[PDB]
């Protein structure tokens, strides 16, 4: 599923991401835009053989099991394929664990390079929330 901007904002708000660990909703929408272009089915392989999955590009090196990342962890206790669903619940619940692990949203490289320090409120402007 390719979400619209305001559609995704509303879904993320319903799932408790607005101001989660102090990160306003626009931060999460901005991260999803540049990680996946709002596409739940996005995948990208990393140099070390791990793979990033879904709307927030969660990495199999630490967070999910895909059966092909030897020596990795599965800290969200899910198959990585569950992060490609049109229902974003699994991605949101795993993202909550990630952002709580000490480094905040700096875990998302695209957030650090394209959202951090910008006017992220623009990403929810005009949306009925």
Which one is catalytic: 7, 18, 35, 119? 35
Stretch that binds Cl ion, among 48-56, 76-84, 90-98, 101-109 (CB under 5 A): 101-109
4 versus 49: smaller Cβ distance to Na ion? 49
Asked if residue 74 binds Cl ion (CB under 5 A), the reply is no
Asked if residue 36 binds Na ion (CB under 5 A), the reply is no
Phi, psi for residue 39 in degrees, rounded to 5: -105, 115
CB-CB neighbours of 19 under 10 Å: 11
Please report, as residue ranges, which positions from 26 to 55 form the binding site for Cl ion (by CB under 5 A).
26
The distance in angstroms from the start CA to the end CA of the chain is 20
Which of residues 36, 57, 72, 91 is near Na ion by CB under 5 A?
A: 72
E strand or H helix at 122, and its extent? none
| Residues 120 and 26: beta-carbon distance below 8 Å | yes
87 binds, among Cl ion, Na ion, none (CB under 5 to 8 A by kind): Cl ion
Which of residues 19, 46, 86, 121 is near Cl ion by CB under 5 A?
A: 121
Which one is catalytic: 7, 52, 66, 119? 52
Residue 21, CA atoms < 13 Å, CB-side half-sphere: 14
Please give the sequence-ordered ranges of beta strands (E in DSSP) within 4-103, or none if there are none. Answer: 43-45, 51-53, 58-59
Q: 48: annotated binding-site residue?
A: no
Summarize the annotated binding site for substrate as residue ranges. 101
């Amino acid at each position: 599923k390719v979400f619209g901007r305001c559609e995704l904002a509303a879904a993320m708000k319903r799932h408790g991401l607005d101001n989660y660990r102090g990160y306003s909703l626009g931060n999460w929408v901005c991260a999803a835009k540049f990680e996946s272009n709002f596409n739940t089915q996005a995948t990208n392989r990393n140099t070390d053989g791990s793979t990033d999955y879904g709307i927030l590009q969660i990495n199999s090196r630490w967070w999910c099991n895909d059966g092909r990342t030897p020596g990795s962890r599965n800290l969200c206790n899910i198959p990585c394929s569950a992060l490609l669903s049109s229902d974003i619940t699994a991605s949101v619940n795993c993202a909550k664990k990630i952002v709580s692990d000490g480094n905040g949203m700096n875990a998302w490289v695209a957030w650090r390079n394209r959202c951090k320090g910008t006017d992220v409120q623009a990403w929810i402007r005009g949306c009925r929330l």
